[PDB]
Design a protein around this ligand. Structure first.
Ligand SMILES: OC[C@H]1O[C@@H](O[C@H]2[C@H](O)[C@@H](O)[C@H](O)O[C@@H]2CO)[C@H](O)[C@@H](O)[C@@H]1O
Ligand SMILES: [Ca+2]
Length: 131
């Protein structure tokens, strides 16, 4: 119960262990579950102890936004190694969620992962895979 979280099953974005974001909020979604939002440039959320097993090279995030932005995936801290960058084009509405993917450098073992935001976006969940 509450064991190590797999990188290969959805990680809920609201399930962060630490963050920088004075106005960042968790809120309920109409279709069930929750998202993080009220995000601004330089905000971040950190997810401890994610088990990448013997490696992942892709990330997918379920996101909503009205203006193009990016989400950096970093190792350990907001200033740690940049694993990859998710390019989030508009989904037309902060309430319309779509899946966007990106390549990451091969990440293996149990790792702390940080999402670093460049601008407004709502995030439901994210997950990793081997390309
Ligand atoms: O409308 C919900 C949506 O708001 C987003 O922030 C808006 C904010 O509502 C608006 O009052 C302000 O002027 O602009 C910001 C930035 O676009 C927020 O980022 C979303 O999380 C939220 O879903
Ligand atoms: Ca969620």
């Amino acid at each position: 119960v509450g064991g190590t979280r797999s990188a290969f099953s959805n990680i809920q974005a609201e399930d962060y262990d630490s963050s920088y974001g004075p106005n960042l909020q968790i809120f309920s979604l109409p279709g069930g579950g929750s998202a993080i939002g009220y995000i601004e440039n330089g905000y971040s959320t950190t997810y401890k102890n994610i088990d990448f097993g013997d490696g992942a090279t892709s990330v997918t995030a379920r996101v909503a936004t009205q203006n193009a932005t990016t989400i950096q995936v970093r190792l350990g801290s907001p200033s740690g190694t940049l694993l990859g960058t998710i390019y989030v084009g508009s989904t037309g509405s902060f309430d319309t969620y779509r899946d966007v993917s990106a390549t990451i450098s091969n990440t293996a073992g149990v790792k702390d992962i940080v999402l670093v935001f460049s601008g407004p976006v709502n995030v439901d969940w994210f997950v990793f895979s081997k390309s």
